[model samples]
Target: SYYHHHHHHLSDFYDPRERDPSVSRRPQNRQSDEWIRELLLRGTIARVATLWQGEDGAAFPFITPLAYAYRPEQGDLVYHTNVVGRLRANAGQGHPATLEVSEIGQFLPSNSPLELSVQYRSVMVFGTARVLAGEDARAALTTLSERVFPGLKVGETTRPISEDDLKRTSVYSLSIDRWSGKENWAEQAIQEEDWPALGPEWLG
Candidate 1:
């Protein structure tokens, strides 16, 4: 399975869940696979984070929400980018990147910082990305356009994909073999001094 956490080390890499009593009071830390699938298929925009390094050796993270075509079976994810975009160039350099898909259902606020939270479902896929080139780029582009804009008239939505376009405009695909999602909601509540931290704050 792509998501089985055999080692379960939270510090070595980015683990989506941590049942640490020091961080959160309501410890619904790990989200079930059921919740991940439901939320993943419901939305199109995922937070696409691009990584790069500056002159000072500082890591730069460019996080933007973008539409993507996801194939659950193949463990593949695809997104569109400009031919000359810096983001494409960054990933083309074999830089590690992440795409995060999330949806917030509600929020819970506590008197303390421990309970300031939101009810949500999110999936983060970290992988090395490269430009999808040649025929593969063409096919993926057509499939994504059709899936995302199926109702558009043929002339409007359907455009001929040229080899030049594939070589020019950038289409990137990632094979994500590991991923996870965290979900928290009203399944449990505290009975002591603090109650449901119901507030309007949205945390990701």
Candidate 2:
């Protein structure tokens, strides 16, 4: 009864559990699956957003930055953290989450501030987060380690993961339900006449 009451109470503070089938806008900026997948693989960090209930019973959004690894086979994003605190609580409660991975490009100077633009590549993934256990958890952890360590092999180049190490940490697997990727890499978008006063160096 205690668990049920607590769980039910928490659920009330979260947004609707249903998933959205479509992205917001920018149809011309949409990227292919392959492009998005590659971006996921190359991204060094991801910003994760989760929801939590406040002391007043109102729900609020929480954003956290984390180093993550992508598993293409399972279409899952893997990240690890300590076993306690809000991160673990949010995952244990099974809240819907979103991961954003991005790359910032060089700035493009324009005579008019409004016309100024820059290059960028970004991907946003929406899904549900869950805590993995036993072998599954270890596998996810190993994958993340390989990504961060790059070229360091487990049980070969470095020491293998010990059982004790796994016990102290929490591994989360976020299933990718829907995703959107966009990019704007053009050198310039404004016509020459619009910003004729601008210098040549600023034009590029």
Candidate 3:
């Protein structure tokens, strides 16, 4: 009921839910599945987008940046927050979610202002979010801890997830329906010969 059904009169091309393969523009920056998954693991924070209904009953897009972990076996992104909020509300109802994870690198140099571009890697995932409970919740929390804290014995270095911990937080699993990865780490931006070449002094 939260999702607005305004765009249905259009064609499939206008369907926002379709994960099309026509990534023609900037195809050079597109990456493979391996690259996407690798980046998803390396990145710690992801922006989760969900639809929230306003007081007027209009649906508004909301983005929440959260510390997330990727469950490779389940192909889902995991995140936890306080038990109650707009995010939890959306997840509880099994609303769709979109996640964006990215890393920014060096700032590339170029002679033309139009040629200026930053080096970056990003992954965008779309799917429905679910709230896990009991043993499943415990397992997902463990995985989230491992990804965020790197290597450390859960039982040895630290205690297991406390009963109170689960009570205080809501664990969400965003299933990976479709995703796309793009990166551009070139040392220098595209050069334009029409204007002029950069001087050696500026080529550092």
Candidate 4:
């Protein structure tokens, strides 16, 4: 019913921008900031997971699929959704949340099923999500609009943000406590010297 990502001392942190150095110290540091930024800029969908505390004091998992934006300049992750007053109550509490974005690529073939795998790149961001208001809030929608429609400017290509529009939308930013990612985008599947070589037919 719930996916509890238990927090530990070492894994626990506060600031969204303060990334643990151990991430890059890794020998196989494929999860670099550059790669993660690239994925975020191109990412179309984000699955946001949050812990919903019910009035009864029970916690449950909730995941909402949404379009998102990552502003490299501001270095923050943001999203907007149609305003629903009742739902805003939950988010106003600023619960810890995790945002996930993934892109799956071609299948990787191997002689053995154990080695068989598919190519995929994914990033998971952990943070406390807070609702944005004022200038930051307007920027959130603009960033989202820019991402969704590169051709459309906020006011020129589309209608500007009216006062009522502000009332109808909820913009949020994830104060990223920590983030992690993995990209298994090997060009080819594991090759076995002893086993027969995989033909070109399998590589594609």
lDDT of each: 0.66, 0.79, 0.81, 0.77
- Model 3 misplaced regions, further than 4 Å: 1-28, 83-92, 194-202
Please give each candidate's TM-score: 0.65, 0.77, 0.77, 0.72
lDDT (10s digit) by residue, model 2, range 1-204? 356557769933485665567743557688888889999999869988877666666666777888999899998999986523243325355668899999988887766677678789999999998878888887888888889889977778867777887788878999999999998877775544433567676553
Q: What would the per-residue lDDT of candidate 4 be over residues 1-204, giving only the tens digit for each residue?
A: 012223322212353565566554545425887778898889979988877556666666777899998877776789986523224325455867789999989888887668888889899988888788877788888889888777779998888887777877789888777788787777877665545767778865
For candidate 3, what is the lDDT?
Answer: 0.81
TM-score of candidate 2 versus the correct structure, residues matched by position: 0.77
Deviation from truth (RMSD, Å), model 1: 12.4
Q: After superposition, how far is residue 112 of candidate 2 from its true place, in Å?
A: 2.1
In terms of lDDT, the poorest run of 10 residues in model 4 is 1-10
Name every residue pair that clashes in candidate 4: 16-176
Q: lDDT tens digits, residues 1-204, model 1?
A: 223344444333466765666443334566656667676667678877776565566667767777787767766777887623333325245556688998777556455566566677778888876677787887777766765675753336656787777777778787785778776665323222333434545222
lDDT of candidate 2?
A: 0.79
Per-residue lDDT over 1-204 for candidate 3, one digit per residue giving the tens place of the 0 to 100 score: 112234433343465774457543456688889889999988899999878766666667778888999988898999987523342335356878899999999777787898798889889999998888888888888888888988965667788888887887789999999999988777788776545678887776
Pairs clashing within candidate 3: none
Higher-ranked by TM-score: 1 or 3: 3
